[PDB]
Amino acid sequence: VFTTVDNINLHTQVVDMSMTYGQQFGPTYLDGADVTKIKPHNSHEGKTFYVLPNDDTLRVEAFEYYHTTDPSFLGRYMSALNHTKKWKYPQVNGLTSIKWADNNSYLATALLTLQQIELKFNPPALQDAYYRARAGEAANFCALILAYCNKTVGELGDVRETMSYLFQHANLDSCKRVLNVVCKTCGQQQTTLKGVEAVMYMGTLSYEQFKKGVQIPCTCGKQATKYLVQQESPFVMMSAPPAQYELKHGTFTCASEYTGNYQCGHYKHITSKETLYCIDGALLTKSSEYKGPITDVFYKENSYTTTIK
Ligand SMILES: CO/N=C(/c1ccc2cc(OC)ccc2c1)[C@@H]1CCCN([C@H]2CC[C@@H](O)CC2)C1
Ligand SMILES: [Cl-]
Ligand SMILES: [Zn+2]
Ligand SMILES: [Zn+2]
């Protein structure tokens, strides 16, 4: 029998049927399933089991693969894998999606988004899982996302919360956003964001509107105008409270629709390819135009410098 924490460095161990896996190894999982209360079977010899990082070597390996120090991570990860592996991951419109189960609509929408933006995860667990998931095997990636976000299967989620959590574990250091807020009493004031903060915004969905200028409260009492001075990033995420919004073809990359409230709701994913495709888990519907309660819109960027002198 073998044990590991990353499924990359494996360790050979001893087969003894009298003691539960929990008494010999500690908490043990086989392909997600909690076998801690189980004693070893004759058919298990040679398989790979996961265990918690109790050995100092396993601590190091788990940190290098998952980029977290949380001891419970693996536990949570494995618990999530017990469900994500049962889900169906149909190909829909050239992307990997999830047939609806366990309120996963936010997860399916985040999954489709991740497959359409240029992102480079730093943790190897995530890089490996990402490439597997882009090809259709997305159980591990979804379990890892649930784990990194401290969400459980069935638990309610926000697509923006998920994307932001994950961006933290991505190489966005080269990203840069220069803004300029212009109040008529306070004057002009410029700011520069780098990293994760440069690729997200909250307040408006329209990126063209962010470039033209958006009204925001100022402390003096007036409304100030914030406009985008410079964007250096592979993508940009714009969020806003759900509202009826008209997605025009060729003007965005993809978008999150949300119907419902803080208690109960359902997420749909819209993407602009050669026309507007609406991916509701395993369901797909095409349309030339789309109007819906949008809350996230994702745009592609390379380098932008404002024309406002
Ligand atoms: C009722 O939804 N309102 C929302 C909201 C509010 C204010 C916002 C302000 C923004 O900045 C200007 C940007 C985005 C905003 C989004 C979200 C969007 C939909 C998904 N989440 C989940 C959160 C966990 C659980 O409660 C289920 C819903 C709620
Ligand atoms: Cl409802
Ligand atoms: Zn002011
Ligand atoms: Zn309800």
The dihedral through the CA atoms of 41, 42, 47, 48 has a sign that is positive
Cα distance between residue 55 and residue 9, in whole Å: 13
Are 166 and 114 spatial neighbours (Cβ–Cβ below 8 Å)?
A: yes
CA-only gyration radius of the chain, Å: 23
Contacts for 143 with CB less than 8 Å, ≥ 6 apart = 32, 77, 78, 80, 81, 84, 85
What the block records as the tokens of 105 is 């609509």
Are 293 and 244 spatial neighbours (Cβ–Cβ below 8 Å)?
A: yes
Are 159 and 296 spatial neighbours (Cβ–Cβ below 8 Å)?
A: yes
Structural domains of the chain in order of their starting residue, each with its CATH number:
1-51 (3.10.20.540), 52-175 (1.10.8.1190), 176-309 (2.60.120.1680)
- For tokens 């306070």, the residue is 186
Ligand 1 atom 3 nearest Cα:
241
Q: Which of 107, 158, 160, 257 to mutate to test the pocket of ligand 1 (most atoms within 8 A of CB)?
A: 158
Are 218 and 254 spatial neighbours (Cβ–Cβ below 8 Å)?
A: no
CB atoms within 5 A of ion ligand 3 belong to: 183, 185-186, 218, 220
Q: DSSP labels for 74-110?
A: HHHHHHHHHHHTTS---EETTEE-----TTTHHHHHH
What is the stated resolution of the deposited model, in angstroms? 2.8
> Kind of pairing, strands 290-300 and 283-287?
unpaired
Q: Which technique?
A: X-ray
Contacts for 55 with CB less than 8 Å, ≥ 6 apart = none
Question: Within 6 Å (CB) of ligand 1, which residues are found?
Answer: 156, 158, 202-203, 239-242, 258, 261-262, 265, 295
Ligand 1 atom 6 nearest Cα:
241
Are 104 and 97 spatial neighbours (Cβ–Cβ below 8 Å)?
A: no
φ/ψ of residue 244, rounded to 5: -65, 125
- Residues facing 179 on adjacent strands: 191, 228
> How many beta carbons lie within 10 A of that of residue 232, not counting itself?
17
